Design a protein around this ligand. Structure first.
Ligand SMILES: *[C@@H]1O[C@H](CO)[C@@H](O[C@@H]2O[C@H](CO)[C@@H](O)[C@H](O)[C@H]2NC(C)=O)[C@H](O)[C@H]1NC(C)=O
Lengths: 49, 123, 48, 48, 191, 182
């Protein structure tokens, strides 16, 4: 078997029926970004004379 | 390129390297077909086992057909591999399970003439 | 190719030959534990 | 919000198999000789 | 009076499966969520240079018994032994695990393999993030007593059991009953 | 506004088991002062819908009962039994052959017979090239005729040009044609 994605030559066998040199690759990306915030302010004043 | 896909932004730098890699090692995409029974020609008893292989292929096509598999969500082509049916996802579809011809009919009774028919439905 | 005279391994063939003719679950359990339950039919070597 | 997708195909070198006098492989011709003479759909489906 | 509480429970468990180049992208985890491009290409080359045999297709192992002393008798006995092995430690005996956990049998002990982002004794704690639809799926029960071979068929008739579909999940996929031809010493062991 | 003041409810059950599911959640909106005095109604989403179990409903693989035993006349005493999953599709067992092997003959008539079974032309013998596959032709060749002046490299991805194609399986097949023979 010739050079496929490797060294000069490989060696097959009688029991092995096939050696294949087809390239396929799958990828995935699932990015999620969250950011919450809270800001509460309360003030009171009372003066009597 | 597959790893950089996460930040693609329509990248083109690694596209030339991918072109070179495919030039070094392509993959089967398009192809014309022909019956494998025509390849056995130089064996001791060629015609006998050739006709036997034709009969075996006829009976195998009668046994297994793509119509036996359940249909696919969006125009997918189901294929039978062993005892499972996988849907071939086309461009624009994804997922583990992503008109088509139906099943053939039973062979009608052999008429007085040679003419025997079988019908398939596009349902 | 699965259907053929596949050259078996020395330990596998030796354990299969040392199996008793009469049904004995003892050695059968140990052979199944050591060698498994299934052999390879097809499949690529895709990473993960 | 936005979403973009592309798809491209490469038309790399052709391939043309010769019509006649094709040279079979070792394992294929080996398995092709173990076929029974009388018709047998089961053993013929194996090489299929 | 001023009171403040801070809690940042951030964790991860990458599964990177090339022997040597495993450590790189997995240990890059500190303050670097995204993996390096060149390191990813190096790991891709390495895992190309070393197989990743997982993701296989299977066939019955007992079929490999072809040319040995007492070949067919040993093959049939291995079929029976494989059936007994499969139904002796079938995870059906194990009780259903919490939060949709998957149970296994290692010897004589059940192990609830916890789903991602879960932990505990029976995968009960750590319900902070599910990221799935939710519910409780169905599970097939253990196979009942085998048929007495009245006409060769089987009467296992796997039915629902103590883990029924309750949280709105889908039922256990699979056949209800099975049917085959009884061996009966396989026609007195092949003529 | 702070849309998180009304936390989302838990995702409801999937509407169907396998075909197609629909689940939704809504804000726990209470009409308080903060809601009305910050225009929280027009800007905060009140529901989120998403699919669940978007796969299909594959039917259970159902085989059929065995058929009648088939008579055997091959060179290897094995009988076939075909039925229409995890159980084997077809299981072959030893047979009781009424007739053993026959019609044994030499395939090669005007060509050379390689010891491996391949039948190649006698012209391909003693040419300094492995044509049988197991170096049978070049076994004891006293002299060879140089067919090529220099050792050249083979075509890349040439083995994919010899593989068979199973139309039903979606994965073409193992090797059937040899791509090293020249
Ligand atoms: C948290 O909120 C910030 C908004 O301030 C998000 O990103 C910030 O973007 C600005 C843009 O210049 C940077 O200067 C800040 O450093 C960023 N925030 C941080 C914490 O670095 C951010 O995406 C939000 N989500 C997170 C941090 O998970």
């Amino acid at each position: 078997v010739f050079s496929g994605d490797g060294k000069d030559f490989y060696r097959l066998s009688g029991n092995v029926l096939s050696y294949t040199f087809q390239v396929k690759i799958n990828n995935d990306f699932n990015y999620e970004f969250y950011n919450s915030t809270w800001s509460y302010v309360k003030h009171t004043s009372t003066e009597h004379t | 390129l597959a790893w950089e896909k996460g930040s693609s932004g329509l990248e083109e730098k690694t596209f030339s390297e991918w072109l070179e890699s495919v030039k070094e090692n392509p993959a089967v995409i398009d192809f014309e077909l022909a019956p494998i029974v025509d390849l056995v020609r130089n064996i001791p008893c060629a015609v006998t086992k050739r006709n036997n292989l034709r009969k075996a292929l006829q009976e195998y096509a009668a046994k297994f057909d793509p119509c036996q598999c359940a249909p696919c969500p969006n125009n997918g082509r189901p294929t039978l591999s062993g005892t499972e049916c996988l849907c071939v996802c086309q461009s624009g579809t994804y997922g583990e399970n992503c008109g088509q011809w139906g099943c053939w009919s039973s062979w009608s009774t052999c008429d007085a003439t040679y003419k025997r028919s079988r019908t398939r439905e596009c349902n | 190719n699965n259907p053929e005279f596949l050259q078996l391994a020395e330990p596998f063939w030796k354990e299969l030959s040392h199996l008793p003719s009469l049904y004995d679950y003892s050695a059968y359990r140990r052979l199944i534990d050591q060698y498994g339950t299934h052999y390879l039919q097809s499949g690529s070597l895709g990473g993960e | 919000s936005s979403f973009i997708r592309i798809h491209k195909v490469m038309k790399v070198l052709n391939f043309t198999t010769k019509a006649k006098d094709l040279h079979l492989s070792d394992v294929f011709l080996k398995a092709l000789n173990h076929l029974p003479l009388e018709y047998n759909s089961a053993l013929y489906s194996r090489i299929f | 009076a001023a009171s403040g509480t801070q809690n940042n429970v951030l964790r991860g468990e990458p599964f990177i499966r090339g022997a040597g180049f495993i450590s790189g992208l997995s240990y890059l985890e500190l303050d670097n969520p995204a993996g390096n491009k060149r390191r990813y290409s190096a790991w891709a080359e390495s895992v190309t240079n070393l197989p990743q045999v997982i993701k296989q297709k299977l066939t019955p192992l007992y079929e490999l018994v072809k040319e040995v002393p007492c070949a067919s008798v040993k093959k049939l006995y291995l079929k029976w032994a494989l059936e007994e092995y499969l139904d002796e430690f079938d995870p059906c005996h194990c009780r259903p695990c919490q939060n949709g956990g998957l149970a296994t049998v290692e010897g004589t002990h059940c192990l609830c393999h916890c789903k991602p982002y879960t932990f505990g004794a029976a995968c009960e704690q750590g319900v902070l993030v599910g990221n799935q639809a939710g519910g409780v799926d169905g599970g097939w029960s253990c196979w009942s007593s085998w048929s007495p071979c009245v006409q060769g068929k089987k009467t296992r008739s796997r039915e629902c059991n103590n883990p029924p579909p309750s949280g709105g999940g889908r039922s256990c996929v699979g056949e209800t009953t099975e049917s085959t031809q009884c061996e009966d010493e396989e026609l007195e062991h092949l003529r | 506004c702070f849309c998180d003041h009304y936390a989302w409810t838990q995702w409801t059950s999937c509407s169907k088991t396998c075909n197609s599911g629909t689940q939704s959640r809504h804000r726990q909106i209470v009409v308080d002062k903060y809601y009305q005095e910050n225009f929280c109604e027009q800007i905060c989403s009140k529901q989120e819908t998403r699919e669940c179990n978007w796969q299909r409903c594959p039917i259970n693989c159902l085989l059929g009962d065995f058929g009648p035993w088939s008579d055997c006349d091959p060179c290897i005493e094995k009988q076939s039994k075909v039925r229409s999953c995890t159980a084997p599709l077809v299981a072959f067992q030893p047979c009781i052959p009424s007739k053993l092997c026959k019609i044994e003959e030499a395939d090669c008539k005007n060509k050379f017979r390689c010891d491996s079974g391949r039948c190649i032309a006698r012209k391909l013998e003693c040419n300094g090239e492995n044509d049988c596959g197991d170096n049978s032709d070049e076994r004891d060749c006293g002299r060879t005729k140089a067919v090529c002046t220099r050792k050249y490299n083979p075509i890349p991805s040439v083995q994919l040009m010899g593989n068979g194609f199973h139309f039903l399986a979606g994965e073409p097949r193992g090797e059937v044609l040899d791509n090293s023979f020249t």
